[PDB]
Enzyme design. Sequence first.
Site, mmCIF file in Angstrom:
data_model
loop_
_atom_site.group_PDB
_atom_site.id
_atom_site.type_symbol
_atom_site.label_atom_id
_atom_site.label_comp_id
_atom_site.label_asym_id
_atom_site.label_seq_id
_atom_site.Cartn_x
_atom_site.Cartn_y
_atom_site.Cartn_z
ATOM 1 C CD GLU B 63 -2.896 -0.765 2.537
ATOM 2 O OE1 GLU B 63 -3.535 0.306 2.666
ATOM 3 O OE2 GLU B 63 -2.924 -1.680 3.393
ATOM 4 C CB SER B 79 5.583 -7.476 6.131
ATOM 5 O OG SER B 79 5.070 -7.418 7.443
ATOM 6 C CG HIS B 193 13.005 -20.761 11.406
ATOM 7 N ND1 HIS B 193 12.023 -20.803 10.440
ATOM 8 C CD2 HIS B 193 12.482 -20.070 12.445
ATOM 9 C CE1 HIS B 193 10.953 -20.166 10.876
ATOM 10 N NE2 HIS B 193 11.204 -19.713 12.091
HETATM 11 N N1 LIG Z 1 10.943 -10.932 8.452
HETATM 12 C C1 LIG Z 1 10.862 -11.595 9.609
HETATM 13 O O1 LIG Z 1 11.753 -12.333 10.028
HETATM 14 C C2 LIG Z 1 9.547 -11.399 10.412
HETATM 15 C C3 LIG Z 1 9.369 -12.052 11.665
HETATM 16 C C4 LIG Z 1 8.181 -11.881 12.419
HETATM 17 C C5 LIG Z 1 7.156 -11.058 11.926
HETATM 18 N N2 LIG Z 1 7.320 -10.393 10.658
HETATM 19 C C6 LIG Z 1 6.240 -9.522 10.080
HETATM 20 O O2 LIG Z 1 5.769 -8.529 11.041
HETATM 21 C C7 LIG Z 1 4.313 -8.391 10.872
HETATM 22 C C8 LIG Z 1 3.646 -8.578 12.199
HETATM 23 O O3 LIG Z 1 4.151 -7.677 13.174
HETATM 24 P P1 LIG Z 1 3.668 -7.878 14.687
HETATM 25 O O4 LIG Z 1 4.389 -9.034 15.265
HETATM 26 O O5 LIG Z 1 3.732 -6.569 15.382
HETATM 27 O O6 LIG Z 1 2.114 -8.306 14.491
HETATM 28 P P2 LIG Z 1 0.671 -7.727 14.908
HETATM 29 O O7 LIG Z 1 -0.361 -8.377 14.064
HETATM 30 O O8 LIG Z 1 0.546 -7.833 16.384
HETATM 31 O O9 LIG Z 1 0.796 -6.152 14.511
HETATM 32 C C9 LIG Z 1 0.356 -5.655 13.234
HETATM 33 C C10 LIG Z 1 -0.239 -4.255 13.412
HETATM 34 O O10 LIG Z 1 -0.144 -3.493 12.148
HETATM 35 C C11 LIG Z 1 -1.475 -2.963 11.819
HETATM 36 N N3 LIG Z 1 -1.725 -2.974 10.334
HETATM 37 C C12 LIG Z 1 -2.065 -4.057 9.541
HETATM 38 N N4 LIG Z 1 -2.170 -3.640 8.255
HETATM 39 C C13 LIG Z 1 -1.902 -2.362 8.302
HETATM 40 C C14 LIG Z 1 -1.907 -1.568 7.168
HETATM 41 N N5 LIG Z 1 -2.200 -2.062 5.964
HETATM 42 N N6 LIG Z 1 -1.609 -0.243 7.342
HETATM 43 C C15 LIG Z 1 -1.326 0.243 8.597
HETATM 44 N N7 LIG Z 1 -1.337 -0.589 9.689
HETATM 45 C C16 LIG Z 1 -1.630 -1.914 9.530
HETATM 46 C C17 LIG Z 1 -2.472 -3.809 12.598
HETATM 47 O O11 LIG Z 1 -3.609 -3.031 13.025
HETATM 48 C C18 LIG Z 1 -1.707 -4.341 13.786
HETATM 49 O O12 LIG Z 1 -1.983 -3.537 14.953
HETATM 50 C C19 LIG Z 1 3.837 -9.469 9.942
HETATM 51 O O13 LIG Z 1 3.310 -8.903 8.732
HETATM 52 C C20 LIG Z 1 5.032 -10.334 9.653
HETATM 53 O O14 LIG Z 1 5.088 -10.661 8.253
HETATM 54 C C21 LIG Z 1 8.521 -10.570 9.914
#
Ligand SMILES: NC(=O)c1ccc[n+]([C@@H]2O[C@H](COP(=O)([O-])OP(=O)(O)OC[C@H]3O[C@@H](n4cnc5c(N)ncnc54)[C@H](O)[C@@H]3O)[C@@H](O)[C@H]2O)c1
Lengths: 233, 233
Positions: B63, B79, B193
């Site tokens: 987005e 992400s 992993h």
């Molecule tokens: N690369 C890695 O090694 C790794 C590891 C763990 C998590 N992640 C990523 O981190 C993300 C999750 O983070 P978290 O642990 O805080 O999870 P979470 O679900 O607790 O937090 C996500 C927050 O972002 C908000 N959100 C969702 N879409 C949105 C958007 N389009 N625009 C604005 N805000 C939005 C939600 O309301 C939510 O509060 C996941 O997408 C995951 O892919 C990556």
Amino acid sequence: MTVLIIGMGNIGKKLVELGNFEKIYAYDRISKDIPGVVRLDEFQVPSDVSTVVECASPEAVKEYSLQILKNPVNYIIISTSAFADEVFRERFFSELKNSPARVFFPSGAIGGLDVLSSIKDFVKNVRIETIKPPKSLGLDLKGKTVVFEGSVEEASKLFPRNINVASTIGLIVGFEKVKVTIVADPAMDHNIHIVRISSAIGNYEFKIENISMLTVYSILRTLRNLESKIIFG
Amino acid sequence: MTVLIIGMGNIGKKLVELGNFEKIYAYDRISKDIPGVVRLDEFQVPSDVSTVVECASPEAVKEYSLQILKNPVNYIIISTSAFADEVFRERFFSELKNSPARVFFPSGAIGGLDVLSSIKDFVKNVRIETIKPPKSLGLDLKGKTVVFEGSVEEASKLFPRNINVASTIGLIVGFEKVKVTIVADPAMDHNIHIVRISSAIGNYEFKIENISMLTVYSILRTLRNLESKIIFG
Ligand SMILES: NC(=O)c1ccc[n+]([C@@H]2O[C@H](COP(=O)([O-])OP(=O)(O)OC[C@H]3O[C@@H](n4cnc5c(N)ncnc54)[C@H](O)[C@@H]3O)[C@@H](O)[C@H]2O)c1
Ligand SMILES: NC(=O)c1ccc[n+]([C@@H]2O[C@H](COP(=O)([O-])OP(=O)(O)OC[C@H]3O[C@@H](n4cnc5c(N)ncnc54)[C@H](O)[C@@H]3O)[C@@H](O)[C@H]2O)c1
């Protein structure tokens, strides 16, 4: 960018052939025919050098570190075994706080330093085992045999060769937290590195079987990263 | 520095508490009571933001990526699963060549991306296996069972959860070279992993047993690195 490469051994000549550089200054106690480099005779850091790369020896790191740090350049060090020396380590980072420079410690022959760097404060201990073929130690054996075990400081005193991997690791978590084991295994065709990390965040195991090329590309990736928009690890 | 954090989930709130920031702008579709952040209501990239950090969702990456890239900031993305989409990936790096920005892909939940980045052109293939406890999949088993095997693209379609680790890896060596395996092992207490890398330079094995905290500290280390004189990996 214009760069200064210290040491024209296997790694230096390799950086010169694979690297993309407008100008290259090179210093090496020897004097072999230099190709596309400006062989200096008296060590120094030319004013147009934006990055210095050490790949000579621990002694070289100790000899020029002080001078290098005066200059505002990216300083890449690989002969980290020199940091196993308490006195030199203290001196170095002293000069660095006052220094306009920036130091880069590429992973070299091992990997996993990305996570180890992230969770360094939480590391309880790191065990690094090196398994070499008996032949490479002038030994004939019928089974695995530990030829050495102890601190990084001691390993360097008996093995002026490697002990660079463990040092970079020591530089990250603290030397007191690293234990080194050098094993001779008659079943082993090539060298292997196993890095076991215990911490409050999790446990990590990194096995490295290099077929040193890895270190070369490790340097190149660091140089490439200086001028890149896509950075990994 | 002043920063913009996208997403205030487990990772966002954690960055806010551990991070050292003069000012923090935060955007999250929800509206939970914000502490030390300037909760925006309409997404945007304030002019004083020097670094943006995404930690919301793949959809968020898609987005705002376009807008973010217009600005001259350091762009941290976690992400990565969103890049498993061929169409979006093409679009993204297009905007990036024209972009004044810089993208950082921290290792997240895994490690070993330092060496994988250095020798990426030589990688023949990468196998990433995830071993979860049956419970975490609502399964009751008496032995290990493979619940999935195939490309990163497909893994994401069935597992909108992780598949971020494999994606960052795919972004490095190329997606065609990554095979993903998700295993349910009743003997497993926690998630694991295992990253197996085959290449012309050597073979590497990285085992990760996290007790996601690792990703948080992975982001923090990247931010800290922006302003540091000592860089590892
Ligand atoms: N690369 C890695 O090694 C790794 C590891 C763990 C998590 N992640 C990523 O981190 C993300 C999750 O983070 P978290 O642990 O805080 O999870 P979470 O679900 O607790 O937090 C996500 C927050 O972002 C908000 N959100 C969702 N879409 C949105 C958007 N389009 N625009 C604005 N805000 C939005 C939600 O309301 C939510 O509060 C996941 O997408 C995951 O892919 C990556
Ligand atoms: N960190 C890692 O993972 C890693 C891995 C492999 C090698 N290394 C380091 O790289 C160094 C070896 O590099 P190489 O493979 O090219 O070896 P090499 O011995 O072939 O090359 C070393 C060159 O540097 C020159 N030299 C030595 N001392 C010097 C000094 N004090 N001042 C100026 N020049 C000097 C020598 O004349 C020689 O030509 C070693 O010191 C080793 O510690 C680090």
